[PDB]
Design a protein around this motif. Structure first.
Motif, mmCIF file in Angstrom:
data_model
loop_
_atom_site.group_PDB
_atom_site.id
_atom_site.type_symbol
_atom_site.label_atom_id
_atom_site.label_comp_id
_atom_site.label_asym_id
_atom_site.label_seq_id
_atom_site.Cartn_x
_atom_site.Cartn_y
_atom_site.Cartn_z
ATOM 1 N N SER A 57 0.785 -1.220 0.000
ATOM 2 C CA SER A 57 0.000 0.000 0.000
ATOM 3 C C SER A 57 0.822 1.277 0.000
ATOM 4 N N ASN A 58 0.199 2.351 -0.462
ATOM 5 C CA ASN A 58 0.834 3.659 -0.531
ATOM 6 C C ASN A 58 -0.176 4.680 -0.025
ATOM 7 N N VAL A 59 0.299 5.871 0.317
ATOM 8 C CA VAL A 59 -0.598 6.918 0.781
ATOM 9 C C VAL A 59 -0.932 7.851 -0.373
ATOM 10 N N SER A 60 -2.214 8.143 -0.534
ATOM 11 C CA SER A 60 -2.657 9.020 -1.606
ATOM 12 C C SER A 60 -3.651 10.055 -1.072
ATOM 13 N N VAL A 61 -3.933 11.075 -1.883
ATOM 14 C CA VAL A 61 -4.853 12.148 -1.490
ATOM 15 C C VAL A 61 -6.020 12.401 -2.454
ATOM 16 N N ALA A 62 -7.170 12.734 -1.877
ATOM 17 C CA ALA A 62 -8.386 13.036 -2.628
ATOM 18 C C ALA A 62 -9.065 14.183 -1.889
ATOM 19 N N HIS A 63 -10.296 14.509 -2.274
ATOM 20 C CA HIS A 63 -11.006 15.605 -1.626
ATOM 21 C C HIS A 63 -12.406 15.204 -1.194
ATOM 22 N N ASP A 64 -12.856 15.766 -0.074
ATOM 23 C CA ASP A 64 -14.177 15.460 0.470
ATOM 24 C C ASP A 64 -15.261 16.416 -0.024
ATOM 25 N N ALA A 65 -16.447 16.291 0.569
ATOM 26 C CA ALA A 65 -17.604 17.102 0.205
ATOM 27 C C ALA A 65 -17.299 18.591 0.096
ATOM 28 N N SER A 66 -16.549 19.113 1.055
ATOM 29 C CA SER A 66 -16.221 20.527 1.051
ATOM 30 C C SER A 66 -14.979 20.908 0.253
ATOM 31 N N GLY A 67 -14.352 19.947 -0.414
ATOM 32 C CA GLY A 67 -13.172 20.265 -1.206
ATOM 33 C C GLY A 67 -11.864 20.243 -0.435
ATOM 34 N N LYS A 68 -11.944 19.812 0.819
ATOM 35 C CA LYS A 68 -10.788 19.723 1.707
ATOM 36 C C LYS A 68 -9.953 18.507 1.324
#
Ligand code: 1NZ
Ligand code: MG
Ligand code: MG
Length: 560
Positions: free
Chosen positions: A365-376
């Motif tokens: 596994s690796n760490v990745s980033v996305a965004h939530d409802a508010s764009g955070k």
């Protein structure tokens, strides 16, 4: 000494072994390139044997010695308890391999006197016989993979009889569940949930002036483990306050099973000898994590790597430290690998330094980033979907004890691939056969749990938070990878999945109740008019603590 010695007898199967994926009407909805999916069989044992067999080379130094003492000092604080035969019996899985003495898993859990009596017998023997090597069985593990531009030869599982197994638990279950934590602290990888893991990697990462990290893959770690290592490992277990009975059991198990022993194939023939770590014993996970941490920590001082934190999960290790410059890092890293080589932990693939946390891969596994409802921005744990998917396909075609799909949905709930493919696919199927109610087994960190599909919303919210249901705008890198994989295995396009999801979602919302809750949260991504997702009541009160405490791969563990 030689990791293994063979007599000549073959690694034999105890029943016919399927290797190809069955052309099934259901699995076909998932992926079309079914000839790319395969399961390992004893037919490749020989190949795996030639790889795991060699003569270990080990040279311990002052750094190694220093770290060991530091580790022993901390274990000195532990007081491990002796489990009773009932507690130990309750920990045995229902599917677990039956004993060669007239009883099986079921009898054990039922405390059937014929079983419990033989169990007491093995225990008494562990208290009197401090030498006699305990017999183990060797088998080829059957796992699902996806071909590669060849194939993976089966992995070998060495394990003792059910009797010896309920005993290992009785004397070491409490130890392997608490000691690793006390000794390695924040570095013990199994205490975390995927999110606590990401938080730990990210926090550790951002705490460096100029970060640098790398994953280290030991070539067949299990066989690199020497007799010295195993005794050293016990030396630590020995620092615990232990009841006489357990101290003796540990001493015996160490000399009679853990350090090595005879091998027997399914046909009861002498296959050879093992002078390294057995995959199927209770101390494997704990033993390998401690051993890896020991060598790795001692290696960092040796290689002059600056302020390096480590995350260990059995044989799996990732390291983050302060960069000293591009070239200096490459220098120290190589310096590291050599230290490990002397410690008897050579690399399978030479380690390469990473300056971006998303590129480091540990625990596949690796760490990745996305965004939530508010764009955070939201950080989450992900991996390549290939194996997960392949297995998911296989578990669709065949009835299977453990469901890697269920476990993967849980652990990778926020990922794009788990939410789009797995969640849809399996609910679509469960909903059909009216199985939404039936509970299924799966494993988290090697341990075995029984999960109710209809509690996925609560579970996911508890371990990941509501954003698990609203993440969007994933990284371009995760996007590329996912796509490539989906395309490679012949998975239907996004649109086909969006349609299939919108559909199951509707069929779920009508059913109402938990089913509605599933449709509402799990598939909110499919509908244009997203709903407001509020904290689920049931989630509020869930004990998912026992879930993330320690590792138990090959430990024959089942938490009910
Ligand atoms: O960043 C995103 N942000 C939001 N959504 C919507 C969305 C979501 F928030 C969650 C979820 F659970 C499904 C889903 F929709 C995306 C949907 C798809 C996507 O990536 C794409 C884009 C175009 C094509 C393919 C693509 N290439 C393919 N090649 C073969 C088979 C299927 C394929 O799909 C992909 C994918 F393989 F998914 F990664 C990225 C995103
Ligand atoms: Mg915990
Ligand atoms: Mg390995």
């Amino acid at each position: 000494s030689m990791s293994y010695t063979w007599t000549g007898a073959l690694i034999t199967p105890c029943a016919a072994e399927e290797s190809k994926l069955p052309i099934n009407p259901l699995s076909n909805s998932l992926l079309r390139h079914h000839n790319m999916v395969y399961a390992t069989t004893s037919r490749s044992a020989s190949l795996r044997q030639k790889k795991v067999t060699f003569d270990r080379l080990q040279v311990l130094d002052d750094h190694y010695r220093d770290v060991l003492k530091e580790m022993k000092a901390k274990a000195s604080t532990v007081k491990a308890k002796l489990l009773s035969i009932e507690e130990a019996c309750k920990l045995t899985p229902p599917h677990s391999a039956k004993s060669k003495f007239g009883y099986g898993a079921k009898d054990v859990r039922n405390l059937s006197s014929r079983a419990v009596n033989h169990i007491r017998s093995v225990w008494e023997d562990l208290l009197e016989d401090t030498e006699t090597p305990i017999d183990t069985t060797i088998m080829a593990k059957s796992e699902v993979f996806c071909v590669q531009p060849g194939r993976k030869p089966a992995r070998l599982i060495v394990f003792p009889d059910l009797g010896v197994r309920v005993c290992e638990k009785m004397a070491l279950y409490d130890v392997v569940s608490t000691l690793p934590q006390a000794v390695m602290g924040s570095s013990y990888g199994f205490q975390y949930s995927p999110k606590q893991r990401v938080e730990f990697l990210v926090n550790t990462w951002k705490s460096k002036k100029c970060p640098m990290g790398f994953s280290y893959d030991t070539r067949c770690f299990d066989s690199t483990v020497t007799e010295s290592d195993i005794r050293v490992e016990e030396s630590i277990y020995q620092c615990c306050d232990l009841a006489p009975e357990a101290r003796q059991a540990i001493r015996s198990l160490t000399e009679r099973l853990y350090i090595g022993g005879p091998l027997t194939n399914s046909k009861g023939q002498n296959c050879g000898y093992r002078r390294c770590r057995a995959s199927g014993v209770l101390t494997t996970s704990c033993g390998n994590t401690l051993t890896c941490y020991l060598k790795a920590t001692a290696a960092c001082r040796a290689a002059k790597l600056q302020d390096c934190t480590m995350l260990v999960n059995g044989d799996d290790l990732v390291v983050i430290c302060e960069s000293a410059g591009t070239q200096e890092d490459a220098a120290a890293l190589r310096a590291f690998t050599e230290a490990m080589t002397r410690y008897s932990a050579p690399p399978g693939d030479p380690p390469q330094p990473e300056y971006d946390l998303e590129l480091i891969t540990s625990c596949s596994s690796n760490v990745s980033v996305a965004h939530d409802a508010s764009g955070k921005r939201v950080y989450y744990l992900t991996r390549d979907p290939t194996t997960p998917l392949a297995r998911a396909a296989w578990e669709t075609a065949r009835h299977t004890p453990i469901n890697s799909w269920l476990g993967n949905i849980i652990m990778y709930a926020p990922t794009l691939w788990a939410r789009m493919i797995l969640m849809t696919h399996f609910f679509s199927i469960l909903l059909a056969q009216e199985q939404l109610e039936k509970a299924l087994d799966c494993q988290i960190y090697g341990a075995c749990y029984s999960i109710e599909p209809l509690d996925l919303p609560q579970i996911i919210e508890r371990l990941h938070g509501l954003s698990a249901f609203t993440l969007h705008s994933y990284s371009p890198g995760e996007i590329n990878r996912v796509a490539s994989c989906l395309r490679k295995l012949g998975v239907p396009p996004l649109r086909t999945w969006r349609h299939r999801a919108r559909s199951v979602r509707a069929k779920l919302l009508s059913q109402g109740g938990r089913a509605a809750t599933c449709g509402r949260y799990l598939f909110n991504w499919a509908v244009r008019t997203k709903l407001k997702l509020t904290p689920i009541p049931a989630a509020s009160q869930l004990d998912l603590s026992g879930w993330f405490v320690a590792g138990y791969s090959g430990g024959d563990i089942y938490h009910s």
